[PDB]
Amino acid sequence: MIQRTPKIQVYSRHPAENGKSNFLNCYVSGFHPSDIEVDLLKNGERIEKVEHSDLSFSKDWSFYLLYYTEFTPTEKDEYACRVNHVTLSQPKIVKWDRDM
Amino acid sequence: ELRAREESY
Amino acid sequence: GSHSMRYFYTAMSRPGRGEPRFIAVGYVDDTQFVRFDSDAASPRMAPRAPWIEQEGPEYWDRNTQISKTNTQTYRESLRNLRGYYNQSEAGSHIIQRMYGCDVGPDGRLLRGYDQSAYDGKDYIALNEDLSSWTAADTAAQITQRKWEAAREAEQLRAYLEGLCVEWLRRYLENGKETLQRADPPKTHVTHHPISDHEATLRCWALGFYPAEITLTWQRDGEDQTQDTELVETRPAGDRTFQKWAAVVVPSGEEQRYTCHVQHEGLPKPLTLRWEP
């Protein structure tokens, strides 16, 4: 069958302010089939107890999920989202671009 | 409210 | 304005790892309000929006039983479709179904839907007449003839014209403070230098509900459609959504560019410029 690779966006719920609690989001979408592995990374290490939305799909039948965790950003800490899927030979890592 | 009594494919 | 109720079913076989998983989620507009997962320790229809929590036990038991029955029905359907395509017992396959109704501001049925896919490809859909089917291929024609013999389109029509709109109207009233409230985007324009020659202008929309939005860049009043990078609208996790649009501009020409924002929550459409 045809398979579709996930798109990945990494971003915060609110505009980021160091020392202020927030939510870190990793939105994976556009993929098929539905099995997917998503980790949120803090300085390269897997964050524990990350939650995610209930599986649903878009008009073109591709799946989407929101993975999220409460966090407090700092100037030093670097965050990222690591995604594996059958379409991916190796896990894809997308850094939280705190520049925009 | 869900639809009940669906016929299988 | 108008409103929608939709259920999204995903049934997934996993040979060697137990029986096919069945997940159902329900939405009103862009607000999820229920979920069911046959893999849960104790599978039940469960609330996902506060305004559905006031439904009584009969509601929760009835919708749970339909979902448990569907867990079995969709396992039958997966076995059937495997046969329709001459597929082995070794592979994993997915049935997806979306059904529901749209109502106008006056609550009257605008359109009903019932559409199915197999392994991500369109399989069979109820036509807009709520009376006939469009089958994608000769396998779906087997389902079509089965559903025609069972008068299943008539059952969809009865649901879509009755329960679907009646319960959607109830949900809209019970959740009116959120479901019938459009929250406008908070907007700003950022400037990201690329080189001495160019910079990126990025137009942001944050915190809006519902997800429908129009973000466009114009240059001298002409849409920059082909030149605009438009990210997929994404959920913030607090019911609201986020989106941005970006265009690469020649240095010094930034004032020829305007970002235009249309959203239901806005008093009037916005026109934004870079404000250094």
| DSSP code string of C130-178 | SS-EEESSHHHHHHHHHHHHTTHHHHHHHHHHTHHHHHHHHHHHHTHHH
Query: Cα–chain-centroid distance for residue A51?
Result: 11
Which of C39-65 are b and which e, b meaning 16 or more Cβ less than 10 Å from the residue's Cβ? Answer: eeeeeebbebbebbeebeeeebeebbe
Distance CA C64, CA C275 (A): 54
Chains C and B touch (3+ CB pairs under 8 A): yes
Query: Cα–chain-centroid distance for residue C188?
Result: 27
Question: For C22, phi and psi rounded to 5 degrees?
Answer: -120, 120
Across the strands, what pairs with C217?
A: C259
Q: Do A4 and C120 touch (CB under 8 A)?
A: yes
Distance separating the N- and C-terminal Cα atoms of chain B = 21
Contact partners for chain B, using 3 or more CB pairs closer than 8 A, are: C
Q: Do A1 and C120 touch (CB under 8 A)?
A: yes
| Residue A35, Cβ density class (10 Å: 0-12 exposed, 13-18 middle, ≥19 buried) | middle
Chain B residues inside the 8 Å CB shell of C150: 7
Across the strands, what pairs with C129?
A: none
Query: Which method was used?
Result: X-ray
Neighbours of A75 (CB within 10 A): 7
**SS3 for C222?**
strand
Which of A81-91 are b and which e, b meaning 16 or more Cβ less than 10 Å from the residue's Cβ? Answer: bbbbbeeeeee
Which of C209-237 are b and which e, b meaning 16 or more Cβ less than 10 Å from the residue's Cβ? Answer: bbeebebbbbeeeeebeeebeeeebbbbb
Distance CA C57, CA B1 (A): 13
Distance CA C125, CA C166 (A): 23
The structure tokens listed for A49 are: 């107890």
Chain A residues inside the 8 Å CB shell of C94: 32-34
Across the strands, what pairs with C9?
A: C24, C97
The structure tokens listed for A32 are: 């098929």
Break chain A into its structural domains and give their ranges. Answer: 1-100
Q: Do C66 and B2 touch (CB under 8 A)?
A: yes
| Residue C15 identity (one-letter amino acid) | P
Q: Are C150 and C231 in contact (CB under 8 A)?
A: no
Q: Do C26 and B5 touch (CB under 8 A)?
A: no
